[PDB]
Design a protein around this ligand. Structure first.
Ligand SMILES: O=[N+]([O-])c1ccc2nn[nH]c2c1
Length: 301
């Protein structure tokens, strides 16, 4: 049928993307759909810390290499991440108690991953899920051991490793303008950038319930008011996959000049972590759902 990536590019955006990995690319009809309809791929798991650095200084790149090679052969942009994210850490990192040791470990992790793929990765998610729901910083091993400087250090280290990449901070529950986490991340990113921290983007990890798409029309412009060169929608899925919810999210990005694109959490409903809510754009037979066709219609205008 029609490609949402082709159409969103024709409207002046950069991509419509999807998360995947080697497993998915060799099963189902995922590779054919990604080839035809999406312009950017992200590794769901193969670039996370537990997958890439299972013991200190010893890296495993097999799965990440597979994705990067596949993307290059198929003409797709690549996003990578997450470089610093508490929920994907191997136990050897979480057990470090010394500030200088953890700082060097974090810098080496960032530099090694980014150097390997230098010039090939459009966007890196550098820090993920750093905020509590009340807007304070989440008390992870990095905050407890290094302190709040871990965020500036991570971004500075990433900028030096690959100056071509766009560097993002990413979080979830940024879907409502009035929710405390949303204004908190805006305030902190503005302050960090004023201090010279190279944060190029805010990525909103958008997991919606039915009817919540409309709120993104106000939340996304508010995130853009932090002044980063880019914002994006990441990890998108919507319980019930209503066309209304999906079109509202797409229109939010179209309405925000600095929104470069949208990435969905996967291809087909049965492979979702909440499959019983049928929250994706393709069904269990790999056919496009009404929400896919509604996005196509919205973009053709
Ligand atoms: O947009 N994504 O689907 C996605 C998946 C995994 C990630 N890890 N870091 N950033 C990510 C984005």
């Amino acid at each position: 049928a029609q490609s949402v990536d082709q159409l969103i590019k024709a409207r002046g955006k950069v991509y419509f993307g999807v998360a995947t990995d080697q497993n998915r690319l060799t099963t189902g009809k995922n590779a054919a759909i990604i080839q035809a309809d999406f312009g950017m791929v992200w590794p769901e798991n193969s670039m996370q810390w537990d997958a890439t650095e299972p013991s200190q200084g010893n890296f495993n790149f097999a799965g990440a290499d597979y994705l990067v090679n596949w993307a290059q052969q198929n003409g797709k942009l690549i996003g990578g991440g997450c470089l610093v994210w508490h929920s994907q850490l191997p136990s050897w990192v979480s057990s470090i108690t010394d500030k200088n040791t953890l700082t060097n470990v974090m810098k080496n992790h960032i530099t090694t991953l980014m150097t390997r793929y230098k010039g090939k990765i459009r966007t890196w998610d550098v820090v993920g899920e750093a905020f509590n729901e009340d807007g304070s910083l989440r008390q992870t091993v990095f905050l407890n051991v290094i302190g709040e400087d871990y965020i500036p250090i991570a971004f500075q280290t990433a900028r030096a490793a690959d100056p071509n990449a766009k560097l993002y901070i990413m979080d979830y529950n940024l879907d409502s303008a009035s929710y405390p986490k949303t204004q908190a991340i805006v305030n902190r990113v503005k302050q960090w950038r004023a201090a010279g921290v190279p944060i190029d983007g805010i990525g909103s990890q958008t997991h919606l319930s039915a009817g919540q798409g409309a709120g993104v029309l106000q939340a996304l412009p508010l995130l853009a008011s932090a002044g980063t060169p880019e914002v994006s929608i990441l990890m998108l899925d919507v319980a019930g996959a209503s066309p209304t919810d999906y079109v509202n999210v797409v229109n939010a990005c179209l309405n925000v000049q600095s929104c470069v694109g949208i990435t969905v959490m996967g291809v087909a409903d049965p492979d979702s972590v909440r499959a019983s809510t049928t929250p994706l754009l393709f069904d269990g037979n790999f056919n496009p759902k009404p929400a896919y066709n509604a996005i196509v219609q919205d973009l053709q205008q």
